[PDB]
Amino acid sequence: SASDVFPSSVYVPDEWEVSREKITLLRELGQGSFGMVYEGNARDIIKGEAETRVAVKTVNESASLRERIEFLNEASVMKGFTCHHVVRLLGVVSKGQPTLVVMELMAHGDLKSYLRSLRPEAENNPGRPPPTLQEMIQMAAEIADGMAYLNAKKFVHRDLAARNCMVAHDFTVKIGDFGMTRDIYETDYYRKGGKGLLPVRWMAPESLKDGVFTTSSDMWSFGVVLWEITSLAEQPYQGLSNEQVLKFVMDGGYLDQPDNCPERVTDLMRMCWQFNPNMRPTFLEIVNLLKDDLHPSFPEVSFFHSEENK
Amino acid sequence: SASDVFPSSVYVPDEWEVSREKITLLRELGQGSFGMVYEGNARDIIKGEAETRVAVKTVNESASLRERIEFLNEASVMKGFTCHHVVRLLGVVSKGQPTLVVMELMAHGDLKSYLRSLRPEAENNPGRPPPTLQEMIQMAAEIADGMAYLNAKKFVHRDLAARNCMVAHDFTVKIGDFGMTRDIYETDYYRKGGKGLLPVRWMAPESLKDGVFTTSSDMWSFGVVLWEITSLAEQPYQGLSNEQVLKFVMDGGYLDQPDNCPERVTDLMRMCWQFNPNMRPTFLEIVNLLKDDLHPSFPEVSFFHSEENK
Ligand SMILES: Nc1ncnc2c1ncn2[C@@H]1O[C@H](COP(=O)(O)OP(=O)(O)CP(=O)(O)O)[C@@H](O)[C@H]1O
Ligand SMILES: Nc1ncnc2c1ncn2[C@@H]1O[C@H](COP(=O)(O)OP(=O)(O)CP(=O)(O)O)[C@@H](O)[C@H]1O
Ligand SMILES: [Mg+2]
Ligand SMILES: [Mg+2]
Ligand SMILES: [Mg+2]
Ligand SMILES: [Mg+2]
């Protein structure tokens, strides 16, 4: 026997582990500043499905230690989430280099790019109109549901923005990009000490001031996401500097409604941009304002309608 | 930088990992033939709970390679289950020796021992009567619910018996012991080639004959569990040899009702012991026969009543 060598050498297998050769990579779907996203195809990673289209997130070998730490923690938080409106983790490859994070493919990429492509002028226009009021309401409901779920799990996303909302083949939007996501179970807030690049244009006054992040500051970013949707992904506060935005927002400033913004959307933004974080709605309330005019499938898949929303 | 060393050395942390020093062990709750079960106490393994009473499963260093393999696979299947009527995995310790599997404490141990302790004669009698009809129906419903869940997840337990049903502080019974559990997703059965000690007294005729195991053969074992409950954990087929049991059951034999067995319990056994596996009920049907006379909390916690039972 070599049963003494066993507990030393083979450990409890990680459920999430997929064998590297099961992954075939097709093309680049995105370059971050240190993170590649590929479209790919995977053999036998979902029970019953012989092959599964997928997105594969990696970090380049130029990744800093901090970047590797963050990707590592992004990978872990994703393991805990199961929601139709949150980008699904499907597997991890940790045996060898590079480390792959395998996720459901969101075929139309991120919302920001998607919105910009729907500008009439866009060189990459897909041949359909910009979003209808209906579609914008459906988008908002999906995003808020997904955010509602994460808040029910006691995480604050901290980086909600159209660039981090992913759009599927059927046009369903889902929250992605959990690098900045923090557990808030014990205290209901996450406080950040000083230095650390986070985009000030999506941030709540209190976060700008005290580095405090709550589900209510996610609500602030949600308003900015509504704004991107109704402006087809303009730059918020164009022609002001980050520094100028910081001051303005901390003083009570916020964005204007985009031209011809629907009154319903405008109304949600006003709620999102209440200075007092206590006064902003919850994501569950957002979904509740929208629930009567959504696709019929929404109740069958949403977090809001599920039993888990106890 | 040493960012090149990182992907080599630190991997995605396993969510289930608990640090060994968080575990304090109090006393032995059971010796298997190669597996210790301890009562213990764990610091900070459930969010919100400062300390958690627990059961800790290990294997001794005398464990064979096959035994270590099995414990390893028992640990993995448990990771996938979340049901009030299935013994909950809480964590694993894989850093160092020995490997610990940390589970919810089932304070009254296993049903078999529990039943025997309720015999009036028992030296270890706790000072309460044997189980009432009501309590036996509640037990049966809990076990069938738990088995219903596992079947919904496409696993066949293969070793259901009072010795593997665990009894909690509040007297709730839950399925445990997944060493023999097999995935049946693709085919709906698991076939076993020849050698491998499995107790013939809990087994279906077709399993005895063809080494085939289905949810319907789990239903067979469920009947035997009803029998143990109504006989206060007698030996099934006492005074016959395994060999004799094999032949008898394969021929159409089964157990007699125990003395003064309730007609309701008798009725379930008859269903469980239909020779044709197609003719036996499903665990969901069992729970459905029992649902109107169960504790009020049953619908709030059961698999049967949950949305997941889609
Ligand atoms: N699951 C998925 N399916 C399809 N495309 C995806 C995808 N995840 C990301 N992408 C594409 O790649 C781009 C970058 O994605 P993501 O937001 O995950 O990268 P990132 O480099 O910003 C992560 P971080 O902010 O933690 O460094 C997205 O804007 C999107 O178009
Ligand atoms: N979660 C738990 N809480 C309390 N006691 C437990 C327990 N799990 C097991 N025990 C006690 O230890 C005994 C052995 O438990 P278990 O059925 O897991 O051991 P085993 O050695 O039979 C596993 P295997 O069949 O895979 O080798 C049980 O009959 C029970 O009394
Ligand atoms: Mg990036
Ligand atoms: Mg991003
Ligand atoms: Mg044992
Ligand atoms: Mg056992």
| CATH number for the domain harbouring residue B97 | 3.30.200.20
Alpha-carbon gap, residue B25 to B3, rounded angstroms: 39
- The residues pairing with A30 across neighbouring beta strands, listed in sequence order, are A37
Ligand 1 nearest-atom number relative to CA A112: 29
- The residues pairing with A128 across neighbouring beta strands, listed in sequence order, are none
Phi, psi of A255 (to 5 degrees): -75, 155
Chain B touched by A2 (CB under 8 Å): yes
CB B83 within 8 A of CB B305: no
Residues 151-170, chain A: which have Cβ within 8 Å of B?
Answer: 154
Å from CA of A216 to ligand 2 middle: 46
B47 Rama sector, left if φ>0, alpha if ψ -120 to 50, beta otherwise: beta
Whether residues A173 and A296 fall in one domain: yes
Residues of A in contact with B307 (CB under 8 A): 306-308
Helices (H), chain B: 6-9, 65-79, 111-117, 133-152, 205-210, 215-230, 242-250, 263-272, 283-290, 298-301
Buried b / exposed e along B212-226 (16+ C-beta atoms within 10 A): bbbbbbbbbbbbbbb
Residues 57-86, chain A: which have Cβ within 8 Å of B?
Answer: 61, 63-65, 67-68, 72, 75-76, 79-80
- Final residue of a structural domain among B61, B76, B105: B105
Ligand nearest to C-alpha A110: 1
Whether residues B88 and B122 fall in one domain: no
Whether residues A145 and A291 fall in one domain: yes
Q: How far apart are the first and last CA of chain A?
A: 52
- Final residue of a structural domain among B82, B105, B128: B105
Whether residues B217 and B238 fall in one domain: yes
Whether residues B125 and B80 fall in one domain: no
For B51, the domain range is: 1-105
- Final residue of a structural domain among B47, B70, B105: B105
Å from CA of B126 to ligand 5 middle: 26
Buried b / exposed e along A18-28 (16+ C-beta atoms within 10 A): beeebbeeeee
Residue A24 token pair: 């075939």
- β A49-57/A36-46 pair status: antiparallel
CB A17 within 8 A of CB B79: no
- Method by which this entry was solved: X-ray
Record the resolution, in angstroms: 2.3
Whether residues B193 and B269 fall in one domain: yes
Residue A145: partners with Cβ closer than 8 Å, 6 or more residues away = A83, A84, A85, A283, A287, A302, A303, A304
Whether residues A26 and A117 fall in one domain: no
Whether residues A180 and A35 fall in one domain: no
Distance from CA of A110 to the nearest CA of B (A): 26
Phi, psi of A166 (to 5 degrees): -105, 150
Residues of A in contact with B92 (CB under 8 A): 12
CB A103 within 8 A of CB A29: no
Phi, psi of A16 (to 5 degrees): -70, -10
B158 Rama sector, left if φ>0, alpha if ψ -120 to 50, beta otherwise: left
Whether residues B250 and B127 fall in one domain: yes
Q: Which of B92, B97, B306 sits opposite A307 (nearest CB)?
A: B306
CA dihedral A268, A271, A272, A278 (to 10 degrees): -150
Distance from CA of A297 to the nearest CA of B (A): 15
- SS3 at position A233: coil
Ligand 2 nearest-atom number relative to CA B74: 26
Is A105 annotated to bind ligand?
A: yes
Residue nearest to atom 9 of ligand 1 (CA): A37
Q: Which of A2, A12, A185 sits opposite B72 (nearest CB)?
A: A12
Axis-axis angle for helices B215-230, B133-152 (nearest 10) = 160
**Structural domains counted in chain A:** 2
Whether residues A230 and A136 fall in one domain: yes
Whether residues B194 and B233 fall in one domain: yes
Whether residues A91 and A147 fall in one domain: no
CB A182 within 8 A of CB A76: no
- Peptide bond connecting A98 to the previous residue in cis, omega within 30 degrees of 0: yes
CB B145 within 8 A of CB B139: no
